[PDB]
């Protein structure tokens, strides 16, 4: 309803309004944010943020130039499934980060949302982060591209909704189920699913400091995190967010990879999964420091086993 629209905009908030969405039902925007928040947390990482000498901005996309996957949007669906993309979108990051680009693939959303079974969640009906990353450890997840790509092992199977144009009626409506687990590479890919599989040495937590998250980020590449979503934040354009107006959506994981401060307002730099029209060209600014929506509470995050790769690479 574009009144809100306009009352955010008359605010002269941090961030400017406008509208992403057209022909959905609420029942898509709720699968939309499909995380479900406040799951039991991995073990704390050390911490070592003391000796990085962190800069003002960062971007992992113009520090990792030669991983492509870093700039990489994709697309949910009409699937809760954003748990399970904010992980495999950070564990393709990397994979090509930690083997200085000579190793670069893209991490299935697709396994991990039919895999994983229980340890994560309800598939699309919203999951755990944790659980995500603590399967990439214990049985790994092969390659797999996007919708309809025909790229890797096991490309996302839930068709994308074009909520951003305004056209075809039947609207976007939250539905469909979580497929089977199929553990098999499609008809095509010259390679055994079993081999396939992309392993990550341990899963862990990063505290909710932000000079620790930093670190991580610039030391060690993306990292996962989870927020809870407000009617308003669906509307966001550009600039800084910062909740000002709307109810409680849900929760919603995403792929934070980056900081810097524009306009005095200290920002994360975060990729959302809601398909590459919506906000600023797939990416959107948080408020940074002051543990926004939660933004800094539940931040995941791993280590890709190199191994594999040496002999064949």
Same mark, same amino acid.
């Given at each position: 309803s574009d009144d809100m629209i306009n009352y955010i905009n008359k605010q002269n908030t941090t961030w400017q309004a406008g509208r992403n969405f057209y022909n959905v039902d609420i029942s898509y925007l709720k699968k939309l944010c499909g995380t479900v928040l406040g799951g039991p947390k991995l073990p704390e990482r050390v911490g070592f943020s003391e000796d990085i000498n962190l800069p003002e901005s960062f971007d992992a996309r113009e520090q990792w130039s030669n991983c492509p996957t870093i700039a990489q949007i994709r697309d949910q669906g009409s699937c809760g499934s954003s748990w399970a993309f904010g992980a495999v979108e950070a564990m393709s990051d990397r994979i090509c980060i930690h083997t200085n680009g000579r190793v670069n693939v893209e991490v299935s959303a697709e396994d991990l949302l039919t895999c994983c079974g229980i340890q994560c969640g309800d598939g699309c009906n919203g999951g755990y982060p944790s659980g995500a990353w603590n399967f990439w450890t214990r049985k790994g997840l092969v390659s797999g591209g996007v919708y309809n790509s025909h790229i890797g092992c096991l490309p996302y199977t839930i068709p994308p909704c074009e909520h951003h144009v305004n056209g075809a009626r039947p609207p976007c409506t939250g539905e469909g189920d979580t497929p089977k687990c199929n553990k098999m590479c499609e008809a095509?890919? &010259?390679?055994?699913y079993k081999e396939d599989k992309h392993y990550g040495y341990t899963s862990y937590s990063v505290s909710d400091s932000e000079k620790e998250i930093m670190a991580e980020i610039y030391k060690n590449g993306p990292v996962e995190g989870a927020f809870t979503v407000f009617s308003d934040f669906l509307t966001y354009k550009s600039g800084v967010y910062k909740h000002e107006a709307g109810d409680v959506m849900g929760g919603h994981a995403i792929r934070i990879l980056g900081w810097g401060i524009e306009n005095g307002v200290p920002y994360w730099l975060v990729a959302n &999964? %809601?398909?590459?029209? %919506?906000?600023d060209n797939g990416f959107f600014k948080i408020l940074r420091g002051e543990n926004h929506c939660g933004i800094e509470s539940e931040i995941v995050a791993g280590i890709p086993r190199t191994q594999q790769y040496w002999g064949r690479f």
């Open positions: 095509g890919y &010259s390679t055994s &999964s %809601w398909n590459a029209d %919506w906000g």
